[PDB]
Amino acid sequence: KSCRNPPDPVNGMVHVIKGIQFGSQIKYSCTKGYRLIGSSSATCIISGDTVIWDTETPICDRIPCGLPPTITNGDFISTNRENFHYGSVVTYRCNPGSGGRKVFELVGEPSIYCTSNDDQVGIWSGPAPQCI
């Protein structure tokens, strides 16, 4: 039994060329700066009584970029501790331990921003730099 058919994204054509049935999946890309909330592909299944989509299709929302990546030393520098949507930036810095004395080094790119060009679903400019 075939599924309900995929919902239609704005400025988008169709999720699947052919494949709305149980054994078929609908794929969903997003406009840059947006990610998929749920699952970019869905597999058609039965809830019990009837055939519906497992994911019900993700909605492309602006990349929440929620809770910036953790750091080796201790969080990051930003005016807001927890992050809002895409375009945000935080700065990681490696910290003195006792006080004046340095105990840590940093990779070379301390400040990151949400750009989602990684193989991940949608993240920052990269993973948190580490104090190496």
Side-chain angles (χ1 to χ4, degrees):
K1 186 179 181 180
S2 315
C3 258
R4 184 177 64 104
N5 278 42
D8 64 308
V10 175
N11 289 340
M13 292 182 290
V14 64
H15 290 271
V16 76
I17 293 170
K18 293 179 181 179
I20 63 169
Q21 294 178 327
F22 287 79
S24 302
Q25 294 177 15
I26 58 173
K27 301 296 180 179
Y28 191 23
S29 50
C30 296
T31 311
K32 185 65 171 177
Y34 298 86
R35 68 169 69 125
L36 298 302
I37 293 296
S39 193
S40 59
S41 315
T43 304
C44 178
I45 57 129
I46 296 171
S47 59
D49 55 341
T50 207
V51 178
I52 60 174
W53 297 100
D54 275 299
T55 309
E56 293 177 2
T57 312
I59 303 300
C60 294
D61 187 14
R62 290 180 179 197
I63 295 176
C65 234
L67 275 301
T70 46
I71 196 69
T72 297
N73 285 340
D75 289 352
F76 53 85
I77 301 298
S78 182
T79 53
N80 295 326
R81 184 182 188 198
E82 295 82 355
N83 184 215
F84 290 163
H85 298 300
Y86 182 85
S88 50
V89 50
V90 299
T91 304
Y92 295 83
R93 67 181 183 101
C94 297
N95 21 86
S98 182
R101 182 181 186 180
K102 291 179 179 179
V103 291
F104 302 120
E105 295 296 341
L106 197 154
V107 174
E109 203 279 74
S111 304
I112 60 170
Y113 58 91
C114 293
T115 184
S116 63
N117 282 137
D118 188 58
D119 289 344
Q120 295 296 321
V121 173
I123 56 111
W124 295 83
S125 59
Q130 64 180 331
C131 297
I132 295 297

